[PDB]
Amino acid sequence: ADVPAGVQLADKQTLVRNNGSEVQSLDPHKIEGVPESNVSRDLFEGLLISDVEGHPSPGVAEKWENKDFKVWTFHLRENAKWSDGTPVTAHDFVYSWQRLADPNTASPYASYLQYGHIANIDDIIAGKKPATDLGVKALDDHTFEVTLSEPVPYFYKLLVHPSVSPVPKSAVEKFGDKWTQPANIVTNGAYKLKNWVVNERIVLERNPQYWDNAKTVINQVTYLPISSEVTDVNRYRSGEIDMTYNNMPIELFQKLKKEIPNEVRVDPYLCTYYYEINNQKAPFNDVRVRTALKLALDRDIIVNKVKNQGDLPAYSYTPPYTDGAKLVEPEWFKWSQQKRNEEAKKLLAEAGFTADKPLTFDLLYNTSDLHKKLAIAVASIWKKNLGVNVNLENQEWKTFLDTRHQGTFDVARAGWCADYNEPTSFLNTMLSDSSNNTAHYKSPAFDKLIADTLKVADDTQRSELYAKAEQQLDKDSAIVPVYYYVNARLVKPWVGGYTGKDPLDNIYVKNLYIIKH
C-alpha cells in the first residue's frame, strides 16, 4: 500500500470484506468466479499483478521482454518466496501451467492457455499430448519463457488472472484435494490462510515472506460469504463489515445514496449481466425461441425501473467500453419494446407455441436478493410480453456454476467480468471448445471470426472482427444480454487505497490501509 503523507493510520489494521458467497475452492486451477478470485489475489501471486488502478504491473516477474509477440521471457525477482520461506521459481510456473492444461485437473479455466495461444495447448486439452509438452520452460530458477503459436500483442495482460498463478507442487502432491486446508496450504501472495470455516468466514493473515511485505499495511482480512445483499448492507451499517460485496440490494440502494452518499462507490466495470440460454437443449436449440426471449425482455424496465443503480441496457456480450471494442448496435435495440414484443410473439408462434401449449421452462439463479428480484421481474415481463411461463430456481454459488457446466438447465442468470481488458476476454468464452462455454454455444462461423483476429497484425481489422463476432453471436441469439454493470458497493470512509479506477476491480488487500477513526 502507498499511504499518503499525513494520513494517520489506525493502530489496528484489520479489514472485513463481504465476498458474495462461499468460494468454489482456494485452488487457483479449480476456480472461475469473482468471489474465488477475490480471495485468490491475496494468496497467490502470478507473473504480473494489477496495480491499484488496474494496469498490468510487476508481480513475481520484475521485468519481461517479447520476441515478435510470440516468445515471452519473464525475469523473476530473486527474493520472491512462498509462505514457508522457500523460493518462488520458474519451475513453479512450469508445473503450474502444466497442471492447468492437464485434462485430469478439469479446470474450468483450462482454455485460458488457449486464449493466450501457448504452444501445443489444443493437443494437451484433447489428451493427444501430455501436459509436459506445453510451450513453457524454466531457462533457470529465475527465468520463465513462454512460447506462443502466433503473435499475441496483448498476452502479458492475461497474466494477472488466478488461473496462471503458481501452486506449490509439494503440497498438492502430498495432500491432494486437502492441500488448501490451513494446516497444509502454502502461499506466495501478500497473505497466508489462517482460518477457513465453510459458510462462515475466510480469515487471511499477513505473509511475512512476501517479497513486498514491508509495504503491506493490513495485518488480517476476513472474507465473508453472505449472498443476501440486504444482509451485507445491514452488517456493513452495523459496523461489522468494512467493504460490502459489489452486488447491491434493490430494497435499500436508493435510500443508501441519500443516506451515505460518500460511502456509495459507483464506478465503471467491465461486466455484462445476461440470461445464459442452454443452446444444446430443446427447445433452446431453436433460434426463434432464443431470439423471442432476447427481444421480449424489456431492458428499460429492468435497468431503469426495477434496478435503477446506473447500469446500462445491453445489446452485446462484450461491454462496448472494453479496450478495443468498436461494436455495432443492432437495429432491434433501437426499436420500440412494442415492436420487439410483436416480433418475439411472432417467432414463438412460428416455433409451434400456443396459448394451449405454451413455452414453459426454468430460470436458474444463484441465491441472492438482487438476482431473485430481477428474475421475478423478468418472469413477469416475459409472461406479460410473450406469454411464456418460467419456474424460478435458486442454487448456492458453487452448485449453480456446476449446474451450468453440466448443462442441466434451461435458462440461467449470468454475469461475465473481463479477466484482461480486451474483447477476447469475453469472446473466447463463446468458442465451441472453450472450457468457460456454459452457454454450450457451438458456431463454426463464430470460431473462425475469432481465429482470424490473430492472423491479421492490424488493430482495426481486429476490432472489426470482434464487432462481426458479436453480430454472429447476436444473430444466433446465443444469450440474452441484459445490462452492462456498474461496480456499486459500500466502502467505509476509513478504508484507504480503493480508487475505484480499475474497471476489472482486481483489488489486492496489500494495497489498502485503515485510517484512524
Judged by the rule CB under 5 A, the positions of this chain that interact with U ion are: 11, 153, 323, 362, 369, 410
> Are the CB atoms for 420 and 426 separated by under 8 Å?
no
Q: How far apart are CA 8 and CA 161, in angstroms?
A: 33
Residue 96 or 278: the one with the smaller Cβ distance to U ion is 278
Shortest Cβ distance from residue 324 to U ion (Å)?
7
Residue 271 or 363: the one with the smaller Cβ distance to U ion is 363
Q: What is the dihedral of CA 228, 234, 240, 243, to 10 degrees?
A: 70
Residue 87 or 153: the one with the smaller Cβ distance to U ion is 153
Residue 134 or 250: the one with the smaller Cβ distance to U ion is 250
Shortest Cβ distance from residue 323 to U ion (Å)?
5
Q: What is the dihedral of CA 474, 479, 483, 487, to 10 degrees?
A: -120
Q: How far apart are CA 116 and CA 143, in angstroms?
A: 19
> Are the CB atoms for 172 and 30 separated by under 8 Å?
no
Residue 92 or 229: the one with the smaller Cβ distance to U ion is 229
Give start and end residues of each alpha helix (H) in 351-386.
Answer: 369-386
Residues whose CB falls within 8 Å of the CB of residue 178, separated by 6 or more in sequence, listed in order: 184
Shortest Cβ distance from residue 265 to U ion (Å)?
22
How many C-beta atoms surround the C-beta of residue 258 within 10 A?
8
Residue 369 or 502: the one with the smaller Cβ distance to U ion is 369
Shortest Cβ distance from residue 503 to U ion (Å)?
12
- In the bound complex, which residue of the shown chain has the CB atom lying closest to U ion? 11
Shortest Cβ distance from residue 153 to U ion (Å)?
5
Shortest Cβ distance from residue 517 to U ion (Å)?
6
> Are the CB atoms for 73 and 66 separated by under 8 Å?
yes
Shortest Cβ distance from residue 11 to U ion (Å)?
4
Residue 393 or 476: the one with the smaller Cβ distance to U ion is 393
Q: How far apart are CA 347 and CA 499, in angstroms?
A: 47
Q: Is 120 left (phi over 0), alpha (psi -120 to 50) or beta?
A: left
> Are the CB atoms for 460 and 290 separated by under 8 Å?
no
